[PDB]
Amino acid sequence: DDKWERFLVPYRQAVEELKVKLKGIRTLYEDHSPIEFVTGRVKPVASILEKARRKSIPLHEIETMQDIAGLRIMCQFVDDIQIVKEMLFARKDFTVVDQRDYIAHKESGYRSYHLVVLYPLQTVSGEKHVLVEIQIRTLAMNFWATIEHSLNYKYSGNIPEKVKLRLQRASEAASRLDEEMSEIRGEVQEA
Amino acid sequence: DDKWERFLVPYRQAVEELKVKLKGIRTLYEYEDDHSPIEFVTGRVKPVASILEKARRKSIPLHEIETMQDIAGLRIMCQFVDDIQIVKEMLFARKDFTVVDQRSYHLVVLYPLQTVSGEKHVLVEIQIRTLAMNFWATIEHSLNYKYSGNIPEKVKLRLQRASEAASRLDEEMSEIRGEVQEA
Amino acid sequence: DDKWERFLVPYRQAVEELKVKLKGIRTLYEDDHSPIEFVTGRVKPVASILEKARRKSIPLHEIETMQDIAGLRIMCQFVDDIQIVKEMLFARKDFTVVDQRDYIAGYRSYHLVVLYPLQTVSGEKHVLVEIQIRTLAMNFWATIEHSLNYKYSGNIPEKVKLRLQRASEAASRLDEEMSEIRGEVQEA
Amino acid sequence: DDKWERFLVPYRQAVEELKVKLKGIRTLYEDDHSPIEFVTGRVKPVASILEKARRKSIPLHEIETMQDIAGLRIMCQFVDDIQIVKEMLFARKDFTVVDQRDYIASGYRSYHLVVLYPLQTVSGEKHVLVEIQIRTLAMNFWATIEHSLNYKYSGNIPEKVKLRLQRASEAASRLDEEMSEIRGEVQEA
């Protein structure tokens, strides 16, 4: 079982390196920083196994899983997301290998931009390329998604319809808040 | 002004001590693992510039700065409106400081800081807000800064609209929470 | 096994709170000489708790009496800094000192034990926390001694044991020359 | 003076990124003996850059040629670890080594190398020089003290204090020698 913890060591180190890197973006800006804060997480073994058994994964290719390592970048404004995206695409300390835009959204109201990078981790024995998922979200998107995640866990994937209807209303309310915020930003920018 | 950096030392330490304390609440829950009434905690000591400036707009003599309740400040952000009362009650029950005032919900605590030369009781303001309110409030504060306290009418309208949208979001979240708890 | 990590939660939080407090001392000083160089803290792993419980025959219902489930280490530059730190700790009002032992007066270290009034969700929990105060040279020697004793399962060969003893004497002489540097400057 | 802190921002970020990288080495090892005990990093204060800026003949036009505005220190338990860390650093591909100087071979002992770190910024890449020193714990202790004394006495320690500092460097060296023999003995497994 520490074969697991030995397997996850590079993923954890990739996340810590990328956290300090991405947090440097906001520091460099202190005008308006396009990043409010940054979090990162390596998937717990249980959650790796559960998803592997839910999506057809024999345990020998789990290394194909794109989100064992994950970061989340939270932005104040919707337009900040495109800015962060472009910064990430320009970085030379990793390469972007995949992306998908749920901002351009899901049936329940999930809003988030995803990309996956291949991070060239320097190890004791040389280089190891590890997949790291990076999501970019507004604060309001992140708030809604966090609640949805908690409810799906609490109800084991079967949220009762009365709660699901309200969750869907909350996603629209979060979306409207982001729209009003966008109007504020655009109006300030017509400087 | 090294006079300043020395004056602010206790305030900064009180904030760091209180941050680790309050962040421990969430930790206590999420082993548990049910719902933490705290989502996150931030803290800041007011910059020398902003202390002086506020001192001069409500007419405060330089020997009366230590009376200011918000040189040191923390902010506690909660998911749900109902969490705010839960956090409030937790803070009133803690024995490692005393609550001396209250009125976003804010309270002020007196923190018995241990220093090398003995004790120093320092005032620290604690604001408790929902995430949605914090988001609006951060933008309002920034605009108030950018426009030096006189926000233009075309921006203030949009800020009011954002405030209403934040309110609607908190209301839906509250309804979600209300449905879940009657389990 | 989930019972264990819930049991250790208060110990971890006590350590994190004490670390930030004790690191504040150096901050308060930094112009002058800080009696503290750095601060570390650790909660003993369940494995190590159980094993010590079995060597000093502690019923699992009595483990909470163990003084070093939670531990901090304070490292100082000079031997004289240790007395200064000791006095600071005895004067603090955010905990109470309940025990101490001085191996400075080849293992060298000062130990004390405090009772920390941890604020929890359900009220107060008083937790025992061991605080060791050491010079850098002392901590270095003790760290090596601990590692070897682990590698050799408590039975260090005589050829390694002789060198470890000479090393503790070298560490002690290093501290002595450092003390003389301090004693002279101080005689300003 | 705000030009100073904008100037130092990349240096600070380079140090923070390299700290997390180098601290990952020990983690990777824990199980086994880590050749690294701990890692610190520092950007030089404006005052100290300027003072060094030409008591050592450097125009502020070319401050960036200074190799130690950004600095890291790697502390090892054993003298033999230093060579291991050195070889690890030369093998890394996330920077390039551009200079080195060896005082393992006043009583000062330390191995130095200088790397060029390709910092990703908002405006593209910035290559910054970062000095990395590798020291035993006992060496680092002594050097920390000398540096503090050199500050107290504005760069010329009086000799009655300097003599003892030399005796102290010799005491640290002897501690390292016994530890080396211990390491040297255990490995003969």
From Swiss-Prot, chain D:
> Which top class of enzyme applies to this chain?
transferase
Binding residue positions for guanosine 3'-diphosphate 5'-triphosphate 1: 42-44, 55, 101, 112, 143-147
Q: Which GO terms describe its biological process?
A: guanosine tetraphosphate biosynthetic process
Q: How is its activity regulated?
A: Allosterically regulated by its own products; pppGpp simulates synthesis 10-fold more than ppGpp. 2 pppGpp molecules bind in a regulatory cleft in the middle of the tetramer in an asymmetric manner. There is a specific contact of Lys-23 to the gamma-phosphate of pppGpp, explaining why pppGpp stimulates activity but ppGpp does not.
Keyword ATP-binding found: yes
Q: Which Pfam families does the record associate with it?
A: RelA_SpoT (PF04607)
Pathway annotation from the record: Purine metabolism; ppGpp biosynthesis; ppGpp from GTP: step 1/2
Q: Where does ATP bind?
A: 42-44, 48, 52-55, 68, 73
Q: Which reaction does it catalyse?
A: GTP + ATP = guanosine 3'-diphosphate 5'-triphosphate + AMP; GDP + ATP = guanosine 3',5'-bis(diphosphate) + AMP
- Outcome of altering residue 131 to V? Loss of (p)ppGpp synthesis, protein still forms tetramers
The positions annotated for binding Mg(2+) are 68
Keyword tags: Allosteric enzyme, ATP-binding, GTP-binding, Kinase, Magnesium, Metal-binding, Nucleotide-binding, Transferase
Report the sequence similarity comment from the record. Answer: Belongs to the RelA/SpoT family.
Q: How does it assemble?
A: Homotetramer.
Q: What is this protein called?
A: GTP pyrophosphokinase YjbM
Please report the organism this UniProt entry assigns to the protein.
Bacillus subtilis (strain 168)
